[PDB]
């Protein structure tokens with residue numbers, strides 16, 4: 001395990017996701033409100049899935065070698081397995097907060113699936129120049145998602161409770177900033193142009209992942225917006 | 232890319248799915264009705280997914296070699312990845328049109344999953360005679376789906392709005408004819424008996440795919456059946 | 463096929479799932495009640511999926527070799543493909559019976575996904591001692607599911623119809639006993655410590671699978687709890 005310099009960040013990531021999972025699990029024990037239960041379920045599952053995939057990367061299972069540029073390049077494929085399930089759960093948290101219509105939710109989840117799926121294909125593609133074609137398609141799917149979060153959701157939040165409108169606005173802003181960093185790190189890291197070494201890349205993704213999951217969850221689950229308006 | 236004679240049909244397929252995706256995306260921009268949004272979301276996602284998988288076939292990612300009959304046989308596995316997601320979306324379009332009950336929808340999607348999954352296993356099976364066992368099981372799942380579309384849905388459409396009944400009937404008929412061709416092409420093509428060469432097989436699937444997705448979508452999204460009855 | 467001593471149990475399993483599938487399919491033909499249709503759909507799909515995966519194991523497709531302990535160890539990976547889809551369907555049968563809230567259903571299905579997914583990783587892991595780390599995480603996800611079935615569902619059933627409360631209690635008890643045997647068989651069988659040989663392991667899983675699917679389904683589909691209260 002320690003044979004890879006990036007192991008320290010995989011281990012820290014595993015620990016922080018594990019701790020985040022346990023914290024949300026305990027916190028949600030005292031919850032009976034049916035609406036709050038939905039948000040706790042979604043939000044606890046996110047770091048639990050990430051915990052398993054960080055562990056698989058730490059132990060070496062979630063790593064494969066991909067030939068491109070005349071080299072055997074270490075590619076952590078387990079990231080995409082994580083993201084396939086956790087990024088639509090994160091979007092679902094946002095969509096339920098603002099009572100999004102079903103068509104909009106399906107558009108978001110579908111675009112998200114395309115985003116992660118094409119990122120996976122790009123990560124595993126052996127023809128170097130083609131990796132960036134997949135990156136571009138994935139990034140276009142991301143831009144669609146960000147567009148919807150701003151010009152379909154923000155003006156939906158404003159007709160809702162003030163506490164859900166303010167909580168949505170904060171989580172929207174956190175999401176757009178954090179999620180936009182992922183394609184940049186991929187592009188300059190070992191999957192793309194290879195300018196930033198894998199150990200630093202792994203650190204960067206770990207900070208983004210913990211912030212986008214445990215950070216996000218801490219903000220959401222401390223808000224009164226997750227509860228039905230009750231006396 | 233041009234090293235494979237079937238590349239021209241993969242390229243045309245990619246282009247037509249891409250163009251179809253953009254057309255539906257633009258067309259649905261001016262839509263606020265919650266019901267119509269569902270149909271636009273579902274129907275736009277279908278060629279978008281197909282676009283990505285056609286591209287993966289064009290670039291060579293979605294192709295593998297399978298030993299059977301003492302030969303290395305080129306198998307485009309990306310078709311099944313496409314179909315796994317797009318065929319239940321197509322069925323969902325039909326089921327929502329007639330306000331199908333939840334049990335019926337689950338039966339359809341489940342049978343569809345079995346249909347595509349067993350087709351994939353058959354496509355990748357190395358014992359030649361066993362490929363046709365999987366083809367038979369998949370075809371039985373197809374026949375179940377077609378049965379339900381006729382003797383569970385058609386008489387559901389007739390108690391609904393005339394515009395939804397007439398639109399459903401047309402899309403049902405398009406679906407049954409087009410979908411029934413797929414097992415025949417598989418059986419006589421490079422996956423099955425090998426009587427029709429891969430380049431012609433690829434052409435045939437491209438015509439079926441564009442018709443079943445973009446053709447289907449053009450009929451559906453031009454109907455007033457996708458809108459709630461409103462003043 | 464007969465080259466593997468466990469083939470007889472794979473063949474019997476295939477037959478019993480096939481027969482169970484046909485029986486439930488015929489039985490549900492005379493059903494119009496929308497609630498009952500849901501239970502028939504879910505419950506018929508379960509042995510149908512299991513039939514396909516038992517067949518893939520019989521024909522040899524669903525088997526791979528995994529190096530650990532200095533040996534090539536036969537691992538039937540198709541079990542996890544089965545279980546990935548059938549165990550959440552089984553939980554859905556239980557959850558719908560007691561009209562579980564959406565948050566609880568998502569927690570169950572999510573924990574179940576983690577349970578099966580980590581079992582799959584453990585089954586395919588090449589470092590022997592690490593296989594048991596994945597077994598432990600999977601078992602913890604199982605224990606969560608069993609906890610919810612007892613201390614979240616049982617007291618939900620009691621405020622419902624007596625026929626649904628009594629049917630739920632029986633199916634809950636069947637589920638907890640049968641499902642708890644699976645991690646034990648894995649641990650002592652060819653995936654784990656290797657004390658029980660593969661042919662006996664295969665027998666054990668076949669008895670558990672038929673009981674947990676066809677047995678379970680026979681109890682559920684003969685109950686009046688699956689019908690809406692109607693005059």
Ligand SMILES: CC(C)CCC[C@@H](C)CCC[C@@H](C)CCC[C@@H](C)CCOC[C@@H](CO)OCC[C@H](C)CCC[C@H](C)CCC[C@H](C)CCCC(C)C
Nearest residue numbers: 109110113114117118120121124280283295308311312316
């Ligand atoms: C509604 C939304 C969910 C829409 C989803 C959007 C989605 C369509 C976007 C594209 C997804 C698609 C790229 C998934 C591809 C998975 C694939 C990378 C798995 C690895 O297999 C690739 C090659 C080795 O590189 O296998 C070597 C050759 C092997 C023989 C491969 C044969 C097995 C195939 C992988 C079977 C395909 C199954 C499905 C792709 C399962 C989807 C997995 C998940 C990653 C989407």
Ligand SMILES: CC(C)CCC[C@@H](C)CCC[C@@H](C)CCC[C@@H](C)CCOC[C@@H](CO)OCC[C@H](C)CCC[C@H](C)CCC[C@H](C)CCCC(C)C
Nearest residue numbers: 340341344345348349351352355511514526539542543547
């Ligand atoms: C409700 C509905 C959805 C019901 C669904 C119906 C469904 C049950 C029908 C059968 C689906 C099942 C056949 C999927 C099999 C996928 C498999 C072909 C992927 C390729 O792996 C096959 C061999 C190489 O040929 O791998 C070589 C050996 C490797 C070590 C394989 C180990 C990895 C396994 C593939 C893990 C299994 C994961 C699940 C099958 C994911 C499902 C993928 C999708 C195609 C259904």
Ligand SMILES: CC(C)CCC[C@@H](C)CCC[C@@H](C)CCC[C@@H](C)CCOC[C@@H](CO)OCC[C@H](C)CCC[C@H](C)CCC[C@H](C)CCCC(C)C
Nearest residue numbers: 049052064077080081085571572575576579580582583586
């Ligand atoms: C809401 C709930 C559903 C939550 C779900 C919980 C879930 C997160 C729990 C963990 C699931 C995760 C372990 C699935 C891993 C599948 C993996 C074993 C498939 C086989 O690939 C493993 C190695 C060979 O051993 O591939 C060799 C290297 C290859 C290059 C691998 C590259 C292809 C990757 C497999 C692509 C990943 C796609 C997704 C994992 C699809 C999920 C399949 C299913 C088994 C969950």
Ligand SMILES: *C/C=C(C)/C=C/C=C(C)/C=C/C1=C(C)CCCC1(C)C
Nearest residue numbers: 119135138139142179182183186212
């Ligand atoms: C918890 C993990 C999260 C929130 C991950 C988010 C990841 C993305 C938004 C990834 C986006 C990518 C692209 C837009 C193109 C390049 C490849 C990706 C997959 C890194």
Ligand SMILES: *C/C=C(C)/C=C/C=C(C)/C=C/C1=C(C)CCCC1(C)C
Nearest residue numbers: 350366369370373410413414417443
């Ligand atoms: C957009 C793509 C569509 C509508 C594809 C439909 C495909 C089928 C109905 C495929 C059916 C098959 C069988 C019935 C058995 C042989 C294998 C298949 C998968 C080709």
Ligand SMILES: *C/C=C(C)/C=C/C=C(C)/C=C/C1=C(C)CCCC1(C)C
Nearest residue numbers: 581597600601604641644645648674
């Ligand atoms: C129809 C099949 C059923 C009901 C299978 C149930 C399987 C399980 C509950 C498996 C549990 C496992 C663990 C808890 C850890 C070890 C690995 C598994 C996957 C066997």
Ligand SMILES: CCCCCCCCCCCCCCC
Nearest residue numbers: 181184185188195196197200204
């Ligand atoms: C969105 C953030 C992307 C920028 C990442 C900056 C990383 C700077 C680290 C120094 C680069 C290491 C190069 C020498 C090894």
Ligand SMILES: CCCCCCCCCCCCCCC
Nearest residue numbers: 412415416419426427428431435
């Ligand atoms: C459902 C349509 C299946 C029939 C396809 C007919 C294809 C005819 C093309 C000629 C066959 C090529 C054989 C000589 C290369």
Ligand SMILES: CCCCCCCCCCCCCCC
Nearest residue numbers: 643646647650657658659662666
């Ligand atoms: C939950 C049941 C697990 C116990 C399984 C008992 C199997 C006993 C069979 C005898 C073991 C075979 C060892 C000699 C080959």
Ligand SMILES: CCCCCCCCCCCCCC
Nearest residue numbers: 084085088089092105106113
């Ligand atoms: C490819 C995996 C996509 C599914 C991820 C799980 C999250 C799905 C959330 C469903 C949202 C509800 C839509 C109506």
Ligand SMILES: CCCCCCCCCCCCCC
Nearest residue numbers: 315316319320323336337344
């Ligand atoms: C194996 C992939 C199956 C899922 C495909 C996505 C479409 C699912 C549509 C869900 C229909 C709603 C059922 C209640």
Ligand SMILES: CCCCCCCCCCCCCC
Nearest residue numbers: 546547550551554567568575
């Ligand atoms: C990884 C596969 C998980 C999906 C299995 C299919 C069963 C899903 C049942 C959905 C229950 C409804 C939740 C709201």
Ligand SMILES: CCCCCCCCCCCCC
Nearest residue numbers: 139143146147150180183184
């Ligand atoms: C186009 C929608 C406006 C809100 C999205 C902001 C786009 C940020 C760009 C992210 C950088 C990705 C490379």
Ligand SMILES: CCCCCCCCCCCCC
Nearest residue numbers: 370374377378381411414415
């Ligand atoms: C049995 C249901 C009647 C409607 C379905 C028509 C079946 C068409 C056969 C398709 C050919 C597949 C090989």
Ligand SMILES: CCCCCCCCCCCCC
Nearest residue numbers: 601605608609612642645646
């Ligand atoms: C902790 C919840 C109480 C009900 C679950 C009973 C646990 C049975 C243990 C199963 C054995 C697995 C190794």
Ligand SMILES: CCCCCCCCCCC
Nearest residue numbers: 128129130132133136137
């Ligand atoms: C070796 C790099 C070749 C450049 C490929 C860039 C493709 C980016 C596509 C953006 C439309």
